[PDB]
Amino acid sequence: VNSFSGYLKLTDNVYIKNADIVEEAKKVKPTVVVNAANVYLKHGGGVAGALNKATNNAMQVESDDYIATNGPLKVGGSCVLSGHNLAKHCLHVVGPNVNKGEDIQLLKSAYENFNQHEVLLAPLLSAGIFGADPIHSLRVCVDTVRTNVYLAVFDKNLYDKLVSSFL
Numbered sequence: 020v021n022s023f024s025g026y027l028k029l030t031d032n033v034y035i036k037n038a039d040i041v042e043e044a045k046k047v048k049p050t051v052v053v054n055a056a057n058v059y060l061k062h063g064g065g066v067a068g069a070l071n072k073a074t075n076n077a078m079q080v081e082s083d084d085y086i087a088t089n090g091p092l093k094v095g096g097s098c099v100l101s102g103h104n105l106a107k108h109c110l111h112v113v114g115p116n117v118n119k120g121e122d123i124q125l126l127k128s129a130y131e132n133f134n135q136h137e138v139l140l141a142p143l144l145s146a147g148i149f150g151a152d153p154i155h156s157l158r159v160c161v162d163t164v165r166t167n168v169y170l171a172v173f174d175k176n177l178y179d180k181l182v183s184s185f186l
């Protein structure tokens with residue numbers, strides 16, 4: 020038993036809710052919140068910009084130190100940093116950005132990072148400003164993640180479309 024509430028169960032291990040991931044993280048304080056990161060951990064907009072703003076820019080300060088030490092992530096890769104006031108940990112995962120021409124097959128590799136964590140709060144990777152089809156992103160998530168994932172979808176219209184079209 021865990022503290023996530025109001026989710027629709029899609030599969031044995033995947034759950035989904037129309038929710039603002041920032042507000043969900045603050046309420047649940049999950050062990051892991053997933054950030055829709057870029058390779059530079061520049062959290063300017065989308066989910067990343069919102070998460071970082073909620074931490075009063077502490078996420079960005081920590082991230083800049085990480086990059087200065089380690090260099091950029093790979094597309095499809097991840098790193099674990101602090102969750103600040105939102106979670107124990109933040110798993111920063113880089114899905115391919117279609118608006119940069121990155122290979123959509125890297126989406127599966129991105130979701131594989133979720134399997135290193137028993138339970139996660141996450142957005143749909145490569146959705147929103149990353150330019151991928153969220154329905155496809157949900158399918159890859161369901162077909163790749165084996166651990167327990169609670170998906171927060173900000174847009175109500177999109178959430179209803181994801182549920183109604185789910186096979």
Ligand SMILES: O=C(Nc1ccc(C(=O)NCc2c(C(=O)O)sc3ccccc23)cc1)NC1CC1
Nearest residue numbers: 065066069143145146147152153156172173174
């Ligand atoms: O900006 C904020 N949040 C916020 C911003 C952006 C996103 C986001 O990229 N989602 C991904 C997404 C969907 C959705 O979630 O709609 S459908 C879909 C389909 C394919 C791929 C992805 C995808 C998520 C959350 N919050 C600040 C105002 C307080």
